[PDB]
Write a protein that binds this DNA or RNA. Sequence first.
DNA 1: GTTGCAGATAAACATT
DNA 2: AATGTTTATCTGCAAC
Length: 66
Amino acid sequence: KRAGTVCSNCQTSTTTLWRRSPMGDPVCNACGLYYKLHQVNRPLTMRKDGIQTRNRKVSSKGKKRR
DNA sequence: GTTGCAGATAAACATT
DNA sequence: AATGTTTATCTGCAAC
Ligand SMILES: [Zn+2]
């Protein structure tokens, strides 16, 4: 349900991937990772209208996992 | 057989 | 300058 999905933590709506918070509050891929690592509400001063982009990270597959 | 969703990695940026 | 930190892009799996 992307339609209407707004980041509960920073209200952004241009997320690369929609994540969910432990409380069930929709969040943008950035808040979900930043929040999980620091578990604190970050000011919207880091929110950017459009999505930032960069040269694509080297192409890599993966490794076998236990 | 195709789409969409969730999650993780590595690189690059900022700081000092 | 190196480390720590951050975020965008990739791949996979499940249900119909
Ligand atoms: Zn957010």
